[PDB]
Structures are given as structure tokens and as C-alpha cells.
Design a protein around this ligand. Structure first.
Ligand code: CL
Ligand code: CL
Ligand code: CL
Ligand code: ZN
Ligand code: ZN
Length: 124
């Protein structure tokens, strides 16, 4: 197992950091650790990204920036305005995937309707 700094550096300087992290994970690499876990009641709304921790009974809440590959790699976010949708907020991760919050936020998308993760919490 490589070390967070080794993994993050490798992704940070790749032309496509997300691809590099996804390909590492698919090869069996250990997920990036030391994300900031929140203590919370687990009777929250279950929404994916919120101003305060909102985990329901099936989720864990994390500090948003600590689960953001771009934030963890100190690089720009892959959009024009460069705004980060996780920084300063709290991200709800299904506990099944809580061993890899960085990879989870990367791969998934918040349902525009119910504000929950598509394919997990989203029951639309
Ligand atoms: Cl390391
Ligand atoms: Cl700890
Ligand atoms: Cl969810
Ligand atoms: Zn970020
Ligand atoms: Zn939905």
C-alpha cells in the first residue's frame, strides 16, 4: 500500500487527475485515507452535500474538502469558475462506500431532484 502522499502526488500531476485516481482504484490500490469524519446523529436528511452534517442511518458524513480529489491534490477544479461544490460543506457517503469517500464523490452525481446521490439514496 502506497501512502496518501504517493497516491495524491501521482494524481495531482497527471493530465487527468480523476482518471488517474479511478484507474488506481480499479487496479486494487488502497483508497486515500485521512478524510475528516464527522460525528453526527445519523437522523439527518440524507442529502448528498449540505451546510451541516446530514447523514441518515445508511450514511457517514465527512468534511467536504477532505473528500475532494482536487482539494486533496491542491489543484484546480475541473470547471471554468473553478468553484468546488464540496469545500466548506459536509458530504454524506453511504457507509458501504465510506472506505473510499474521495473515490465515491468523484464517481457519483447528486440527483438534481431530491438532492441525494443518484443510484444510492436517490429513490426517484
Ligand atoms: Cl506516502
Ligand atoms: Cl483519527
Ligand atoms: Cl446516498
Ligand atoms: Zn474541491
Ligand atoms: Zn432523486
Amino acid at each position: 500500500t502506497m501512502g496518501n502522499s504517493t497516491v495524491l502526488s501521482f494524481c495531482a500531476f497527471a493530465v487527468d487527475a480523476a482518471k488517474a485516481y479511478k484507474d488506481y482504484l480499479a487496479s486494487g490500490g488502497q483508497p486515500i485515507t485521512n478524510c475528516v469524519k464527522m460525528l453526527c446523529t445519523h437522523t439527518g436528511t440524507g442529502q448528498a452535500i449540505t451546510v451541516t452534517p446530514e447523514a441518515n442511518m445508511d450514511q457517514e458524513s465527512f468534511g467536504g474538502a477532505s473528500c475532494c480529489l482536487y482539494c486533496r491534490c491542491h489543484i484546480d477544479h475541473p470547471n471554468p469558475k473553478g468553484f468546488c461544490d464540496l469545500k466548506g460543506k459536509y458530504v454524506q457517503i453511504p457507509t458501504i462506500c465510506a472506505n473510499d469517500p474521495v473515490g465515491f464523490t468523484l464517481k457519483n452525481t447528486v440527483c438534481t431532484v431530491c438532492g441525494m446521490w443518484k443510484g444510492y439514496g436517490c429513490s426517484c
